Design a protein around this ligand. Sequence first.
Ligand SMILES: *[C@@H]1O[C@H](CO)[C@@H](O[C@@H]2O[C@H](CO)[C@@H](O)[C@H](O)[C@H]2NC(C)=O)[C@H](O)[C@H]1NC(C)=O
Ligand SMILES: *[C@@H]1O[C@H](CO)[C@@H](O[C@@H]2O[C@H](CO)[C@@H](O)[C@H](O)[C@H]2NC(C)=O)[C@H](O)[C@H]1NC(C)=O
Ligand SMILES: *[C@@H]1O[C@H](CO)[C@@H](O[C@@H]2O[C@H](CO)[C@@H](O)[C@H](O)[C@H]2NC(C)=O)[C@H](O)[C@H]1NC(C)=O
Ligand SMILES: *[C@@H]1O[C@H](CO)[C@@H](O[C@@H]2O[C@H](CO)[C@@H](O)[C@H](O)[C@H]2NC(C)=O)[C@H](O)[C@H]1NC(C)=O
Ligand SMILES: *[C@@H]1O[C@H](CO)[C@@H](O)[C@H](O)[C@H]1NC(C)=O
Ligand SMILES: *[C@@H]1O[C@H](CO)[C@@H](O)[C@H](O)[C@H]1NC(C)=O
Ligand SMILES: *[C@@H]1O[C@H](CO)[C@@H](O)[C@H](O)[C@H]1NC(C)=O
Ligand SMILES: [Ca+2]
Ligand SMILES: [Ca+2]
Ligand SMILES: [Fe+3]
Ligand SMILES: [Fe+3]
Lengths: 87, 641, 641, 436
Amino acid sequence: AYLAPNNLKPVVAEFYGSKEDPQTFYYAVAVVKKDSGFQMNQLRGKKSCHTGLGRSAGWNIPIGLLYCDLPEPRKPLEKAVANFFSG
Amino acid sequence: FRLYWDDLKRKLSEKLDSTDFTSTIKLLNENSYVPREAGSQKDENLALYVENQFREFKLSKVWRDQHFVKIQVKDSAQNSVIIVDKNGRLVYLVENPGGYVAYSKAATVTGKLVHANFGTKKDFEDLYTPVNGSIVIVRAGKITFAEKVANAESLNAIGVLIYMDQTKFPIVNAELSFFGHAHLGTGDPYTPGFPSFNHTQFPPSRSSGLPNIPVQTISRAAAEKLFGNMEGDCPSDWKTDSTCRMVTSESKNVKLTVSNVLKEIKILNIFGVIKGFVEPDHYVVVGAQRDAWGPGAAKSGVGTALLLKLAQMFSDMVLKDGFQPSRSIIFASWSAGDFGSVGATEWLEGYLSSLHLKAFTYINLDKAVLGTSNFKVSASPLLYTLIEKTMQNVKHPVTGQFLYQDSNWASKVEKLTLDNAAFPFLAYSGIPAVSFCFCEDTDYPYLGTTMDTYKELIERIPELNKVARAAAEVAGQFVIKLTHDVELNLDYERYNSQLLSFVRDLNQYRADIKEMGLSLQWLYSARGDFFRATSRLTTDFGNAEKTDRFVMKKLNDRVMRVEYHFLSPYVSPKESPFRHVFWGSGSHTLPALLENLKLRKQNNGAFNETLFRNQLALATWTIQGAANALSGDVWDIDNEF
Amino acid sequence: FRLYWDDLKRKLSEKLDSTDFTSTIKLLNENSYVPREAGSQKDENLALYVENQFREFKLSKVWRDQHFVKIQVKDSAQNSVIIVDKNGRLVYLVENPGGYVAYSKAATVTGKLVHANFGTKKDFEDLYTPVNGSIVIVRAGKITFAEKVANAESLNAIGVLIYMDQTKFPIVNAELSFFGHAHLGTGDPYTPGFPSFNHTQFPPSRSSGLPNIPVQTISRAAAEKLFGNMEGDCPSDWKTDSTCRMVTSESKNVKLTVSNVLKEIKILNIFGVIKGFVEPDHYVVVGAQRDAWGPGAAKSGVGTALLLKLAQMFSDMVLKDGFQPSRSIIFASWSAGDFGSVGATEWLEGYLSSLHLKAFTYINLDKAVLGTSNFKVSASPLLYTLIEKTMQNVKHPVTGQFLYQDSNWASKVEKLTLDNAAFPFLAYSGIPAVSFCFCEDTDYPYLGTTMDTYKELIERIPELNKVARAAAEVAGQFVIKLTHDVELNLDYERYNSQLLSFVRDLNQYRADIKEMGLSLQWLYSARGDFFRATSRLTTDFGNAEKTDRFVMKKLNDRVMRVEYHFLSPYVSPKESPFRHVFWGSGSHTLPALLENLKLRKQNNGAFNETLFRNQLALATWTIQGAANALSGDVWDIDNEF
Amino acid sequence: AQVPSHTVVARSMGGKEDLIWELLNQAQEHFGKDKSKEFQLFSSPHGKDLLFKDSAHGFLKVPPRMDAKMYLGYEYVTAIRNLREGTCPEAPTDECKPVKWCALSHHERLKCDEWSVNSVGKIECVSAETTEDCIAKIMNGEADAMSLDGGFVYIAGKCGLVPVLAENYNKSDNCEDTPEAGYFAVAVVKKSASDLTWDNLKGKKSCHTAVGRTAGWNIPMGLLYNKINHCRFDEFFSEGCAPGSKKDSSLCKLCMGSGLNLCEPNNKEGYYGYTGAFRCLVEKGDVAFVKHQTVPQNTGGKNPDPWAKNLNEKDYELLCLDGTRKPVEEYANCHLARAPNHAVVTRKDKEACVHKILRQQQHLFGSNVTDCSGNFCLFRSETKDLLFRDDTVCLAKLHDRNTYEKYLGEEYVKAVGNLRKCSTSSLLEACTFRRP
Ligand SMILES: *[C@@H]1O[C@H](CO)[C@@H](O[C@@H]2O[C@H](CO)[C@@H](O)[C@H](O)[C@H]2NC(C)=O)[C@H](O)[C@H]1NC(C)=O
Ligand SMILES: *[C@@H]1O[C@H](CO)[C@@H](O[C@@H]2O[C@H](CO)[C@@H](O)[C@H](O)[C@H]2NC(C)=O)[C@H](O)[C@H]1NC(C)=O
Ligand SMILES: *[C@@H]1O[C@H](CO)[C@@H](O[C@@H]2O[C@H](CO)[C@@H](O)[C@H](O)[C@H]2NC(C)=O)[C@H](O)[C@H]1NC(C)=O
Ligand SMILES: *[C@@H]1O[C@H](CO)[C@@H](O[C@@H]2O[C@H](CO)[C@@H](O)[C@H](O)[C@H]2NC(C)=O)[C@H](O)[C@H]1NC(C)=O
Ligand SMILES: *[C@@H]1O[C@H](CO)[C@@H](O)[C@H](O)[C@H]1NC(C)=O
Ligand SMILES: *[C@@H]1O[C@H](CO)[C@@H](O)[C@H](O)[C@H]1NC(C)=O
Ligand SMILES: *[C@@H]1O[C@H](CO)[C@@H](O)[C@H](O)[C@H]1NC(C)=O
Ligand SMILES: [Ca+2]
Ligand SMILES: [Ca+2]
Ligand SMILES: [Fe+3]
Ligand SMILES: [Fe+3]
């Protein structure tokens, strides 16, 4: 949103904890079905549910974590992630 | 299904695995095209063949151009060299030379003879005997012929003879004679700075670089018969034959007669284009030289063969395969590339208005294949990063490893020599250029002779096909890397090392600059401003959207004139044309300032203090001017306070 | 919402019936600003006042730019003009002139005095008395001072005395002095070509324009004492008074002494800018001179008044009202316009690499309001249609009529003279420039004078508020009409009538051109090529969408550089800076080619035939090259076949 | 991983931000968490996460100093930018890139660029106009190092930078090893006025180095704060020269930097720095707050600039905090407090590189080099104390102690912490926005 010709700035941020101790950060986690038999490193070719393209907790931390195990060509990212997950 | 860089590189390699260069080098060396003087009939048939092929590969526009140029050919009377005494009555004939130097003045003179090792400007001080009042001989190689005649003419000589020894140029035949042009500079000389079209009425004008002395080439056995009568011994620093000698005997004398007449010939240039889809008016030029004095198999056949095959691969790859280049591509075949390459220079000076900020790269496919040992590149420094990545993706044709073997090659690179066809583009027009050869450790021996034929070239280079395939791959890598993507690959930060090398070279003479009474520190600050300029521009390429086109056009127009702003705007283009403050000739460039300060430590009385202080003012404000022109606008400077 | 044109000129008139110029012209004539030579303290206080105002009006960015120049100022000793008898015994003096001439020489001489009309070259060749070795007198007006001294220097005279008669200049006070710069060319002469910043470290140099002869301005009543001693009648063709006489009597002879000293003073330029919303980096410069020698309300008062009120008006229309410009606007107050306009020329030579191809119009507000009757404009031809539309909107201040009375006005326009401040933008840089004045038929009497002040100004013009309202309205129409729209209103059709005028002027010498052996046809075809380029460009505006921006930027860039391509690329910008081939100075311009050609018929020997061949070749190829660069890409130039 | 919150974006120029905050601030009170039963802001019947999250509880203002890149941080901007461009760095540390130094206001650009050429090419220069902006420019990535005094070492310490090398002052044969304790802050008054006293400072003119610095602002006004008990200092003193403070104050309008450069915290003003505080002390002030070494460095023809050429030591005497007089020659028995020496700060990833390049770059251009005119001396300067403190001897190594908490010591962190509610520097507010 801030890359030109947009130039947009954040003006009001929102809080996630209780009213007593306001938290500003929030965690990103990966939820899976029980007894499905995957750890983080077998995570290949299995059908994955993302929340958006460029959203923080759903794209950048999952693809950034498993990112450098991908084969060449890395760019464009969606081609290699598209060949990485089986749909 | 769009195409990205990986698919397009393997698509290019699938094209290069199929083509056969060797049949086309054998086809540009058939008996119907083989002796190609400039403007002669045998040039014309090849020119219609190249225009016909460019129509046959379905290029988007094929167009040609013809204009009239003065060259200088042999008269019916035979120029010759001869040995006489003080009276002239003793007559012993040496020889009658077949080859001739174009643009040598027509005169007959006598005199004693003095040797020089190459005619370097360092040589005539290291020489023992005084040079003036006497004919010189020089040994062919390491500089252009025009610099030899310009140096020996600058020290009041009378004539220049040129020969090829056995150590530098090992050839079996001791009879072979050769050729070279003597214009210091480039282009048709009798129209300096304006085009040779017949719109320009052909006014009487004469270039300021033409010589005044008769220059002649002799063979090797013709040189040794002069070495029999001359008495002396060469220094052992000159790696040479055993038979060289310095000066003549005292009763002896050498007269040479030179008779060459001007002729007015017709010059062709043959062009084709591939249109672009995003920006059609911005284009990249790829050239080649079409004629050469001998048969010309190493000098013109390989360049034209590589040009025709790149036309086949790129027009085939745009039409059938589905490639979409964002910028246009101009294929060019220059003629009279051998008299200082007058085709290219008259083409720029014809169409300099239409090429202003439009063209942004030349690639020189001339003399690409000369051997198989090294890889020698020479380019304007915006292409260096580009060449980096290309040298990581081209395998050497003999050994399977890559060409980027030495991690520090940007300092080994020499600047563009004046006989190279890219030097009028970079030095004269401010367009980034590149040339490249697969040069052997020793240079190709019979280059401009009559011995340059095909079967000698296949005996010297045993696998011509894989080497020509590697050079065609490097040129294809360049053309795709510039014209596939929204971002230009001209790396602009590479000029920072060049400015740092200049100021670091002047920082040793700071001790005398403080003696004149003027400080250096404004030029330190000018280098600083160019660094913050390219840093701010790298930030602006950071914070932009890549998908959007209207902002990336505004940035690419700001990168595309980072070379135009180094052309010095205080000198006439008609008088001293090569206006590039780094890389060009004159009294305005930066080596001329380093030289003109370096003279003062000699305390000779030869340096010129007013010319120095003037040079420092103009060079300082030129560097600071380019730094202001990069960083933004008029109001974002960041001026004095 | 949006604001269209007819809403917006209405909003300008509603902002314009409120402002008051009269109080500001009183403010620039108070006792805290009134004598302001360049570099004086009052100049710097006025520059702090203006640079405060540009902050208070909420401009987007306000910036200062200073540099050091060399002017010439009076010495502590007087300079006099003093009659010397032949005896050498009794010595009589005429005046100690309060006013001086800039850039003259410090000298003292005696000799005969000879009247000349205005110092036209026609006058000096019409004279009967030989000119050489004798001081001259001329009348001010119709020519710059520097060309009077230039002609009197070419005819080998020693001294020049300049005065104001009553017929051309009707005033009451006969004892009045004035001022003028004598430098032919413009800019700071001790740094020609390169700017006068503190990075150049001021190398030794000198311009070509500086005369070597003393110049002095004398009053009318001083001229009556000199005309009391002379004899030989003025001829009746000189529309003059009844007192002027031709040469001195043989007894007496005058003595001119002029003693002036150089000085190095600090120059301030104040700027402020309003940003754009579609394309911020292209801009349009509006200027005014900030100082004058005497009290100076006609020269620099009305310019700074119009400038401050316009900056208030457009900053108020953008901030409060909702006007949205598409391109930036730079408002500018430079000093030292009186020494041949060095405050602007040193800026153009300063930042030429950054406003290459960016600044597309300069407007001059200087000397706007002098007379109340007429309306005179002088401009580049690209702006003519623009001015025509403005003359169909603005009403006259005195009568209710419009300005567009004469429907045939494009021929009465005279080219920009060198004492105008818009001349280095057009002729040196290549920016289309426009100046205008409400001027009475005879020029304004006390314009460089100690009596130029607001009292006598409001005596001449009894309604100054309405006329200043009209001139600010015209400059408002120019800025708004240039800036609100996606299409520039530069009319490139207009150079075509100039070219037809030139080739038609050469047809009457086709008889002499045919005798030399060279034809004229290629120059006709050059005119035709420029016609088809402009017609093709107009049709390409016919087929373009208007809301689209990427296909209107590519058609606006071709319009912006139709002015730059008429600058000659074949001359050095230090040796002769004004390179516009139409409107320039030197041997390269087109009336210089005509003025070379007509001298062949008289057969003196002054014609230079080789020079004429080079001028025909270079003029033909410059016009033909602009005609190539206006129409399409490279491949769409049609050749001679 | 942890990520920053969702934000309401808006324009950068037109805004309008105060109507967004004015709207939502009156919205979360009445409508936040069961505050109205009729309408819910953070829940919906026909969907979830509409216009806001259903996990949000409140809205606070983004400070006006914080732009986009400082909002996301540096680690997260670098991760998203590398994920777009596709680089995946290997990074073994063999050769290091040239360090992009940061310098302010066109004198430090001169000395910095001369140092850029006299090096091989290892030190580059990027400018700024305040020190507070150059700290942000380190946090973005457009510069790497800086030399800051301890008050701005506290600010850049809060923001996430670390100190690497710490300037010494005491001459020794081994000073790269030795950890110096620090330097003493004093206030300097004259022999013309003998009525002045630390207990009697009401309505007197007070010259300062600049806002945020140790000896000029933090140490004296932290001690004056516990007596005067209120945050405003423009009402305690009558006048005084302190640059960088707000343009309205009397503290702004005593200074001299003309024109429009009044209270600009850099070498545009004459009165900026230690020596410029001594200039307003000599010219127009009553008391100045400087280091103890200021009066010896401007006494007795050490400065060739004439106003300090004429002056003398004995007339100027420094005042204790109880109310007595003790001489400038004897500074140890009378000082305001012991403030730590200045320090070079950089990001946590380029710590080893700036350590290595400045250690090597020190020995070439240090205090060993004589004949400074006609050569380069990095630690000397043209008496304006630019890019480095002029009486540095060597850049001391920091081992076991590289954190603003550990380096600044407990008494100074407490001494700034007693003033933290009075601080008005916007970048400190934006850096302390991060903390829950
Ligand atoms: C343009 O110039 C060329 C070269 O000057 C002209 O060609 C010459 O024409 C004359 C007259 O017919 C011949 O005697 C010469 O032999 C021609 N030169 C050559 C090299 O063949 C040409 O006629 C000119 N005009 C046009 C329209 O092309
Ligand atoms: C040194 O430079 C000066 C400055 O160019 C030369 O002096 C003059 O240069 C002008 C060109 O502007 C020419 O007319 C002549 O070359 C010189 N004119 C004179 C001496 O009246 C000078 O020639 C240069 N060389 C030397 C050896 O001094
Ligand atoms: C810019 O150049 C000017 C011209 O020399 C310098 O101004 C002079 O400086 C000297 C010494 O400081 C003094 O005579 C005056 O201050 C100035 N002389 C005149 C006649 O004005 C100026 O110092 C230069 N600027 C810089 C930054 O060095
Ligand atoms: C007429 O034009 C000719 C053009 O050749 C001038 O002659 C020479 O012009 C060059 C310019 O490059 C000068 O360097 C030479 O010194 C000139 N030679 C002579 C003898 O003048 C010539 O000056 C021009 N004017 C006249 C009156 O003939
Ligand atoms: C040039 O040659 C002549 C004889 O060859 C000689 O006398 C003269 O000294 C030479 N010139 C110089 C500068 O040595
Ligand atoms: C120049 O002036 C002198 C004055 O004594 C005169 O005699 C001479 O004739 C003049 N020159 C010419 C060429 O007329
Ligand atoms: C100071 O410089 C000299 C010479 O460059 C060098 O030998 C010496 O080691 C340096 N001093 C220190 C403390 O490194
Ligand atoms: Ca030419
Ligand atoms: Ca100048
Ligand atoms: Fe989220
Ligand atoms: Fe400090």
